[PDB]
């Protein structure tokens, strides 16, 4: 169901959402067990955190000590779970055409932390939750409408025999070369060159490296653009770009706000 379709009947149900990850926090430590130590007698006791509240012992547990207000919290001996907050934007497939996309913050825990990264389109299954937020930290006073978030419980994105058999072939060079772009009429030495570029040479320690570099020139209204598109589709981790400007993607590494951005070459 749509992120835009959620309503207060959902406030404790297990829901399903689809959308785009904008960013995530670093891992946030979330206390699961407080660890208390007695100032006078150095006795220690573990207290589970209940509904986010520290159930502080008012007096020391040991009846032979039983001093009031003497227990103190030892922060770095408490036990912490992992929490992370991720901001999920409404996918443009679902938006009405005349307004901004919505977004929902989602909380994700333990080994589900870093299930996704910025730019990932995902599904999540999670309980829709809501909580109040304060008017000011020095007061208990709460605003009369709650923050909403989804508290996730599942996330999801969006052979050798044949290899050696084909490797026995005699026509393999021509077979593979024509296969990179069989929709394109014969330019076969270009196709062979680009296949050899896909394979590449080798590296060495000492630098000399396995890169192979190719250029196509000649008339503009011809198959070279389609050829670049096909090798882009074939290669595992390459990119497509053009020699100047930036449609939020540019060639060179570049300093901007302060952050270094890596360009298309990098």
């Amino acid at each position: 169901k749509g992120m835009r379709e959620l309503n207060p009947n959902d406030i404790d149900k297990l829901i399903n959402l689809k959308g785009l990850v904008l960013r995530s926090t670093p891992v946030i430590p979330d206390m699961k067990v407080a660890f208390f130590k007695c100032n006078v007698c150095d006795h220690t006791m573990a207290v589970e955190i209940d509904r986010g509240v520290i159930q502080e012992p008012a007096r020391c547990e040991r009846i032979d000590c039983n001093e009031p207000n003497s227990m103190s919290l030892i922060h770095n001996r408490c036990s912490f779970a992992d929490k992370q907050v991720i901001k999920l934007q409404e996918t443009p497939d679902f938006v009405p055409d005349g307004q901004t996309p919505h977004s929902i913050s989602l909380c994700v825990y333990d080994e589900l932390v870093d299930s996704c990264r910025a730019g990932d389109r995902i599904e999540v299954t999670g309980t829709f939750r809501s909580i109040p937020i304060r008017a000011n930290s020095r007061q208990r006073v709460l605003k009369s409408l709650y923050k909403t978030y989804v508290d996730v419980v599942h996330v999801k994105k969006v052979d050798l025999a044949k290899i050696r058999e084909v490797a026995a072939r005699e026509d393999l060079y021509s077979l593979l070369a024509r296969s990179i772009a069989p929709s394109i009429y014969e330019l076969e030495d270009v196709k062979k060159g680009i296949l050899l570029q896909l394979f590449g040479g080798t590296n060495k320690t000492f630098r000399y490296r396995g890169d192979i570099n190719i250029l196509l020139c000649g008339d503009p209204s011809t198959s070279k653009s389609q050829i670049l598109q096909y090798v882009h589709k074939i290669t595992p981790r390459g990119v497509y770009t053009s020699g100047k400007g930036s449609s939020a993607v540019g060639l060179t590494a570049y300093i901007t706000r302060l952050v270094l951005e890596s360009g298309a070459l990098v």
Binding site: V40, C41, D42, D64, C65
Partner: peptide, 12 residues
């Protein structure tokens, strides 16, 4: 004398 209490470390 001042009303006071002895608080002892040896019972730690």
């Amino acid at each position: 004398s001042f009303k006071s209490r002895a608080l002892n470390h040896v019972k730690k």
